């Protein structure tokens, strides 16, 4: 689950991935099944939203036992893994996965062409805000991070629902495509560590245990300020039950098009699978992707 | 009586094996709606029970004060085959009997409708605040121990259970504030609807007790339809009137419906 | 009752974060100013031990007056005559319970909530330690009450036979404290579209009096308790919140 030790039980079962991928919680027909679990487990719906410190002594004692009698029927048996826990004395436990979320959420929040580089100095100066927090002396800097992490995956979960009702997915013959143009809080999505958060929530959503196909996604968000259109090519996955490791093609076949018309594109990243493009250049560029398909 | 064990096994088949309209037994798909709202209230219609067994339909109108206890006690073990870890969430279910057309407007209440399931409409006038009730009289005996076992004074009766020969003799008992189960309480009165009045006569009041689930379901000015029972409340019934032994009558509510 | 003092007496002496330990530096600086209290953050209890908070969360009315005598055995390890009983003020942040949904289940449980204060009252006197003499026997004694559950939970005995209640309170040798009797209204942004805003009445102890002006936004951590005065029903009690620790905002 995401952040058990610093949030409640119920608020971790929403904003997860391998629970959302198997119960389809974005609709209404799946949210009835979630309370149907806590009936069997013997947990009231007042206790299950208290934060994880103030739960009873005889429930956190018995969490390793209830998670194996009642978790089989809903398919969630790939939940219990083995992880690491670092306690510094009287402070309290923080696992390994619950630390890397507090560093992926301290790297973009909590701080024409010269409007661009005034953003890139807001990321480079944000880098030392996690470099200090990695140590063991400053814990008042870490607990700013966790309460900046839950308001990241509450703004993603309220966008990723609003796609899967309107169904803005084109189901084309080579890949799948989504283009987001309007909604709330579209300022957040200029960081490449924010699109890969939402795109990782869509890949494990639709390319799920249920066999429909196996096709790549292409995302494209937008803001104002010369209409940047940060597009990003993604990859497909398997539902954890590992033979094909190549799994990417958007470096080569994309690169041929940008040397064909070079219509207002900049390759300005460590990665070759995310660029910007002007607003007038989106429509003739995407048609060329369907041509010369290398997949 | 001791015939109740024959009743317990034979209405249980009308929580599981009563089906209608091509499957989907409506009281197997009802207990799954408990839990996911977590609400300790089974809805039970009266037409869906009277068509099957006409014996128990008579034993609701005769004496539901002892009938509904057995109808609650086996109602726990219907859910327990679905949700086996349900002893710790309220540990109790009470039931919600639906329509039974006895009394027309308000004023047909004679002796012949005593201690029986009555259905009556009206208009909420005024209501008090929400309070706790005892529900578990636990003594403060000085000779015995101050746990002393659970004893029940759960009515409008306030039982005069005197403590005699507890440990060695009659220890003096009080009440403490320890480990008992309180429950909610709210009295709301009700008067006659202005559409179905006879000509000339003033409307009449009556006091209704709500209990433990149905508090904050009314709002003053609603056409409410009460399906309570009808009893004979003591404890101060016309204290200045002992030459006329005249008793006070309060409807204890069992369900609440809105306007329809 | 027994040895739960020593499981708390080691908590004040030995709790320690990274370099500078707090509850022997908050107990010493609150004696030189003559302040006579202490402020326990409630997250630090359950990090040190879970069995202590298990008792405190279940039955709080009988254990917080055991922690108040576990402090006054430690302040005699620092000062060395009149040291009274200390007061325990605690604060935390789990989850606010809104003022509308306070069921019959939260009787005697630590509950925090929020709201707007309407009115106050005038101060009063409650007795802690009083001296009794009988009228005929003249056999002196001393009853020390420390627990607070408003009318009467501990009273005078009936014999030291002699008559019905032969006991007199002597007013020349006692100690007294203050009470405040606020009132608290819920915040109007949890709107009662067809209801009026309800209210509750609290009490306060000796060191929280005269702290808050009417008309502020507070958060209040207390014990939701019950009392049975007749100052309208049969076997009906009335609810009230015994405040232990008012965490107001900046008053502004």
Tab-separated table of N, CA and C in Angstrom, chain C residues 61-142:
chain	number	residue	atom	x	y	z
C	61	UNK	N	-10.395	7.805	33.189
C	61	UNK	CA	-10.814	8.537	34.374
C	61	UNK	C	-10.082	8.083	35.621
C	62	UNK	N	-9.467	6.905	35.596
C	62	UNK	CA	-8.849	6.335	36.783
C	62	UNK	C	-7.332	6.323	36.709
C	63	UNK	N	-6.752	6.734	35.586
C	63	UNK	CA	-5.320	6.636	35.384
C	63	UNK	C	-4.640	8.000	35.310
C	64	UNK	N	-5.297	9.013	34.756
C	64	UNK	CA	-4.731	10.361	34.795
C	64	UNK	C	-4.596	10.913	36.214
C	65	UNK	N	-5.499	10.633	37.166
C	65	UNK	CA	-5.153	10.937	38.562
C	65	UNK	C	-4.127	10.008	39.181
C	66	UNK	N	-3.626	9.005	38.462
C	66	UNK	CA	-2.446	8.293	38.928
C	66	UNK	C	-1.177	8.863	38.338
C	67	UNK	N	-1.273	9.555	37.209
C	67	UNK	CA	-0.079	10.179	36.664
C	67	UNK	C	0.195	11.508	37.338
C	68	UNK	N	-0.824	12.122	37.932
C	68	UNK	CA	-0.603	13.376	38.633
C	68	UNK	C	0.150	13.169	39.936
C	69	UNK	N	0.082	11.977	40.523
C	69	UNK	CA	0.918	11.706	41.682
C	69	UNK	C	2.238	11.075	41.294
C	70	UNK	N	2.419	10.746	40.020
C	70	UNK	CA	3.715	10.265	39.574
C	70	UNK	C	4.622	11.409	39.182
C	71	UNK	N	4.066	12.602	39.008
C	71	UNK	CA	4.909	13.762	38.778
C	71	UNK	C	5.417	14.313	40.099
C	72	UNK	N	4.543	14.431	41.100
C	72	UNK	CA	4.922	15.041	42.370
C	72	UNK	C	5.819	14.158	43.228
C	73	UNK	N	6.147	12.950	42.781
C	73	UNK	CA	7.241	12.210	43.392
C	73	UNK	C	8.550	12.447	42.661
C	74	UNK	N	8.503	13.095	41.498
C	74	UNK	CA	9.727	13.392	40.775
C	74	UNK	C	10.193	14.801	41.088
C	75	UNK	N	9.268	15.719	41.363
C	75	UNK	CA	9.668	17.084	41.679
C	75	UNK	C	10.287	17.198	43.065
C	76	UNK	N	10.245	16.134	43.860
C	76	UNK	CA	11.023	16.103	45.086
C	76	UNK	C	12.384	15.451	44.881
C	77	UNK	N	12.706	15.041	43.655
C	77	UNK	CA	14.079	14.682	43.325
C	77	UNK	C	14.847	15.830	42.706
C	78	UNK	N	14.229	16.993	42.569
C	78	UNK	CA	14.844	18.132	41.915
C	78	UNK	C	14.952	19.318	42.860
C	79	UNK	N	13.918	19.553	43.667
C	79	UNK	CA	13.900	20.722	44.537
C	79	UNK	C	14.733	20.550	45.800
C	80	UNK	N	14.967	19.324	46.254
C	80	UNK	CA	15.738	19.115	47.479
C	80	UNK	C	17.038	18.361	47.195
C	81	UNK	N	8.359	23.971	51.223
C	81	UNK	CA	7.983	22.573	51.362
C	81	UNK	C	6.710	22.292	50.583
C	82	UNK	N	5.943	23.349	50.337
C	82	UNK	CA	4.592	23.218	49.799
C	82	UNK	C	4.659	23.037	48.292
C	83	UNK	N	4.612	21.786	47.845
C	83	UNK	CA	4.436	21.472	46.432
C	83	UNK	C	3.073	20.825	46.266
C	84	UNK	N	2.128	21.466	45.597
C	84	UNK	CA	0.797	20.884	45.427
C	84	UNK	C	0.826	19.748	44.412
C	85	UNK	N	-0.348	19.200	44.142
C	85	UNK	CA	-0.473	18.239	43.064
C	85	UNK	C	-0.323	18.943	41.724
C	86	UNK	N	0.527	18.392	40.874
C	86	UNK	CA	0.750	18.967	39.561
C	86	UNK	C	-0.456	18.692	38.677
C	87	UNK	N	-0.543	19.383	37.552
C	87	UNK	CA	-1.640	19.211	36.617
C	87	UNK	C	-1.070	18.724	35.298
C	88	UNK	N	-1.793	17.842	34.622
C	88	UNK	CA	-1.336	17.280	33.363
C	88	UNK	C	-2.108	17.881	32.204
C	89	UNK	N	-1.393	18.507	31.278
C	89	UNK	CA	-1.989	19.145	30.113
C	89	UNK	C	-1.436	18.450	28.885
C	90	UNK	N	-2.300	17.890	28.053
C	90	UNK	CA	-1.810	17.132	26.915
C	90	UNK	C	-2.436	17.606	25.620
C	91	UNK	N	-1.727	17.387	24.518
C	91	UNK	CA	-2.192	17.800	23.205
C	91	UNK	C	-1.638	16.852	22.153
C	92	UNK	N	-2.359	16.743	21.041
C	92	UNK	CA	-2.058	15.774	19.999
C	92	UNK	C	-2.784	16.201	18.739
C	93	UNK	N	-2.630	15.428	17.665
C	93	UNK	CA	-3.389	15.661	16.434
C	93	UNK	C	-3.622	14.359	15.661
C	94	UNK	N	-4.727	13.680	15.972
C	94	UNK	CA	-5.104	12.480	15.238
C	94	UNK	C	-6.112	12.780	14.132
C	95	UNK	N	-7.341	13.129	14.513
C	95	UNK	CA	-8.448	13.393	13.589
C	95	UNK	C	-9.567	14.066	14.363
C	96	UNK	N	-10.048	15.193	13.854
C	96	UNK	CA	-11.123	15.914	14.510
C	96	UNK	C	-12.426	15.150	14.382
C	97	UNK	N	-13.140	15.027	15.488
C	97	UNK	CA	-14.518	14.552	15.490
C	97	UNK	C	-15.420	15.775	15.403
C	98	UNK	N	-16.288	15.876	14.399
C	98	UNK	CA	-17.166	17.046	14.295
C	98	UNK	C	-18.187	17.045	15.418
C	99	UNK	N	-18.702	18.233	15.721
C	99	UNK	CA	-19.549	18.384	16.896
C	99	UNK	C	-20.920	17.744	16.738
C	100	UNK	N	-21.362	17.476	15.513
C	100	UNK	CA	-22.690	16.918	15.321
C	100	UNK	C	-22.770	15.435	15.638
C	101	UNK	N	-21.728	14.670	15.352
C	101	UNK	CA	-21.769	13.221	15.514
C	101	UNK	C	-20.964	12.842	16.750
C	102	UNK	N	-21.602	12.947	17.900
C	102	UNK	CA	-21.057	12.447	19.153
C	102	UNK	C	-22.086	11.458	19.675
C	103	UNK	N	-21.840	10.183	19.419
C	103	UNK	CA	-22.820	9.159	19.714
C	103	UNK	C	-22.838	8.838	21.197
C	104	UNK	N	-23.513	7.756	21.516
C	104	UNK	CA	-23.428	7.179	22.837
C	104	UNK	C	-22.237	6.259	23.007
C	105	UNK	N	-21.393	6.123	22.001
C	105	UNK	CA	-20.243	5.249	22.134
C	105	UNK	C	-19.034	5.946	22.731
C	106	UNK	N	-18.945	7.269	22.625
C	106	UNK	CA	-17.764	7.989	23.069
C	106	UNK	C	-17.838	8.399	24.522
C	107	UNK	N	-18.559	7.671	25.356
C	107	UNK	CA	-18.603	8.010	26.769
C	107	UNK	C	-17.299	7.572	27.414
C	108	UNK	N	-16.621	8.520	28.069
C	108	UNK	CA	-15.302	8.355	28.695
C	108	UNK	C	-14.245	7.878	27.696
C	109	UNK	N	-13.986	8.703	26.690
C	109	UNK	CA	-12.914	8.482	25.735
C	109	UNK	C	-12.307	9.818	25.355
C	110	UNK	N	-11.000	9.823	25.110
C	110	UNK	CA	-10.296	11.039	24.713
C	110	UNK	C	-10.756	11.427	23.316
C	111	UNK	N	-11.258	12.645	23.189
C	111	UNK	CA	-11.945	13.132	22.007
C	111	UNK	C	-11.440	14.536	21.765
C	112	UNK	N	-10.998	14.837	20.552
C	112	UNK	CA	-10.752	16.239	20.264
C	112	UNK	C	-11.748	16.734	19.232
C	113	UNK	N	-11.984	18.039	19.246
C	113	UNK	CA	-12.993	18.655	18.404
C	113	UNK	C	-12.646	20.125	18.237
C	114	UNK	N	-13.576	20.901	17.689
C	114	UNK	CA	-13.309	22.295	17.361
C	114	UNK	C	-14.594	23.097	17.463
C	115	UNK	N	-14.478	24.419	17.435
C	115	UNK	CA	-15.668	25.238	17.425
C	115	UNK	C	-15.398	26.681	17.787
C	116	UNK	N	-16.471	27.389	18.132
C	116	UNK	CA	-16.421	28.795	18.514
C	116	UNK	C	-16.994	28.904	19.914
C	117	UNK	N	-16.319	29.646	20.781
C	117	UNK	CA	-16.754	29.817	22.160
C	117	UNK	C	-17.765	30.952	22.238
C	118	UNK	N	-18.925	30.676	22.830
C	118	UNK	CA	-19.939	31.708	23.004
C	118	UNK	C	-19.678	32.514	24.268
C	119	UNK	N	-19.745	31.867	25.427
C	119	UNK	CA	-19.749	32.602	26.682
C	119	UNK	C	-18.825	31.912	27.669
C	120	UNK	N	-18.582	32.581	28.784
C	120	UNK	CA	-17.792	32.091	29.902
C	120	UNK	C	-18.672	32.141	31.141
C	121	UNK	N	-18.054	31.983	32.304
C	121	UNK	CA	-18.771	32.141	33.557
C	121	UNK	C	-17.857	32.828	34.557
C	122	UNK	N	-18.332	32.915	35.784
C	122	UNK	CA	-17.541	33.426	36.892
C	122	UNK	C	-16.837	32.243	37.536
C	123	UNK	N	-15.675	32.490	38.139
C	123	UNK	CA	-14.910	31.420	38.761
C	123	UNK	C	-15.622	30.897	40.003
C	124	UNK	N	-15.135	29.776	40.520
C	124	UNK	CA	-15.780	29.120	41.645
C	124	UNK	C	-14.717	28.467	42.506
C	125	UNK	N	-15.154	27.548	43.352
C	125	UNK	CA	-14.245	26.813	44.211
C	125	UNK	C	-14.677	25.363	44.278
C	126	UNK	N	-13.737	24.468	44.047
C	126	UNK	CA	-13.909	23.049	44.288
C	126	UNK	C	-12.871	22.659	45.325
C	127	UNK	N	-13.175	21.668	46.143
C	127	UNK	CA	-12.282	21.298	47.227
C	127	UNK	C	-11.411	20.138	46.785
C	128	UNK	N	-10.148	20.140	47.208
C	128	UNK	CA	-9.260	19.010	46.960
C	128	UNK	C	-8.984	18.230	48.236
C	129	UNK	N	-8.543	18.917	49.279
C	129	UNK	CA	-8.112	18.289	50.515
C	129	UNK	C	-8.748	19.026	51.676
C	130	UNK	N	-9.660	18.362	52.371
C	130	UNK	CA	-10.436	19.013	53.416
C	130	UNK	C	-10.290	18.221	54.709
C	131	UNK	N	-10.660	18.845	55.821
C	131	UNK	CA	-10.479	18.251	57.135
C	131	UNK	C	-11.825	18.140	57.823
C	132	UNK	N	-12.107	16.965	58.368
C	132	UNK	CA	-13.411	16.647	58.924
C	132	UNK	C	-13.233	16.383	60.409
C	133	UNK	N	-14.195	16.825	61.209
C	133	UNK	CA	-14.314	16.415	62.596
C	133	UNK	C	-15.758	16.041	62.879
C	134	UNK	N	-15.953	15.051	63.742
C	134	UNK	CA	-17.284	14.622	64.148
C	134	UNK	C	-17.787	15.529	65.259
C	135	UNK	N	-19.108	15.623	65.399
C	135	UNK	CA	-19.664	16.560	66.367
C	135	UNK	C	-19.639	15.983	67.780
C	136	UNK	N	-19.848	14.670	67.914
C	136	UNK	CA	-19.884	14.063	69.241
C	136	UNK	C	-18.558	13.401	69.586
C	137	UNK	N	-17.999	12.629	68.654
C	137	UNK	CA	-16.749	11.935	68.939
C	137	UNK	C	-15.562	12.888	68.910
C	138	UNK	N	-15.630	13.919	68.057
C	138	UNK	CA	-14.521	14.836	67.753
C	138	UNK	C	-13.273	14.080	67.312
C	139	UNK	N	-13.469	13.098	66.441
C	139	UNK	CA	-12.382	12.316	65.876
C	139	UNK	C	-12.003	12.908	64.530
C	140	UNK	N	-10.836	13.543	64.472
C	140	UNK	CA	-10.424	14.253	63.269
C	140	UNK	C	-9.926	13.274	62.215
C	141	UNK	N	-10.064	13.657	60.951
C	141	UNK	CA	-9.558	12.911	59.809
C	141	UNK	C	-9.204	13.880	58.683
C	142	UNK	N	-8.932	13.330	57.498
C	142	UNK	CA	-8.581	14.149	56.342
C	142	UNK	C	-8.907	13.372	55.077
